[PDB]
Design a protein around this ligand. Structure first.
Ligand SMILES: O=C(O)CCC(=O)C(=O)O
Ligand SMILES: [Mn+2]
Length: 200
DNA sequence: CTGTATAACTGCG
DNA sequence: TCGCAGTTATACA
């Protein structure tokens, strides 16, 4: 069963890949194994200013690729068993294929990611983004671009659960912005993996 | 009377 | 606590 999230120019789907016990073990592995960028490679440029990102970020993928957003370029670290395990699985369930993963770790509800689009040039056109989540459940919010105001279109929000998979298809990232807002009452960490298809 | 776009923030309310 | 407005130690088209 897929919760088919749909609206005007919004095409996404949500399912639960892993039960609790497996999801726990994968999370513990991710916590044990994943290496996040620091300093220079953890700062972005937005509205003329540089900031440390209010979370942690890592990139893994096939050598030679790079991903650039908001004035920052990230080079992939070579794949590790646990990420390939997740990629290979996601690929099985979707028939889709991936060469890159951005990992975001939100230590608690005060870590977040601001409203944005994944509109970057180096993503293959048409091809989806695979968002896999572990740890604390957090709210994910979809907001229409012309809502913020020319168009009264409503917001779509859903919890992303421990062991869940959110597919983001086309034209989702051409019309809708997304964010993971601050949730002060959340005390536990969350790890998110956005598997992507990059080219250059 | 009129350019858009901004993965983050402070300053509200 | 939550969210929304404005924004610009600017970069374009
Ligand atoms: O952490 C999430 O669930 C979303 C991450 C995201 O939007 C991104 O990596 O572009
Ligand atoms: Mn995104």
């Amino acid at each position: 069963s897929w919760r088919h999230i749909r609206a005007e120019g919004l095409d996404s789907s949500y399912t639960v890949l892993f039960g609790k016990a497996e999801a726990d073990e994968i999370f513990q592995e991710l916590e044990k194994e994943v290496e996040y960028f620091t300093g220079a490679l953890a700062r972005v440029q937005v509205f003329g200013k540089w900031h440390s990102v209010p979370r942690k970020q890592a990139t893994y993928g096939d050598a030679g690729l790079t991903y650039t957003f908001s004035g920052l370029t990230l080079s992939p670290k070579p794949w590790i068993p646990v990420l390939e395990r997740i990629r290979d699985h996601v690929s099985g369930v979707t028939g889709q294929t991936f060469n890159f993963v951005l990992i975001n770790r939100y230590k608690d509800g005060s870590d977040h990611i601001c409203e944005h689009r994944d509109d970057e040039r180096e993503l293959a056109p048409g091809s989806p983004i695979a968002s896999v989540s572990f740890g604390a459940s957090r709210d994910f919010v979809f907001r229409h671009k012309d809502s913020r105001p020319s168009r009264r279109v409503a917001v779509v929000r859903l919890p992303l659960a421990h062991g869940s998979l959110l597919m983001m298809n086309h034209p989702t990232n051409t019309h809708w912005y997304h964010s993971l807002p601050v949730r002060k009452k959340v005390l536990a960490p969350r790890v998110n993996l956005t598997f992507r298809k990059i080219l250059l």
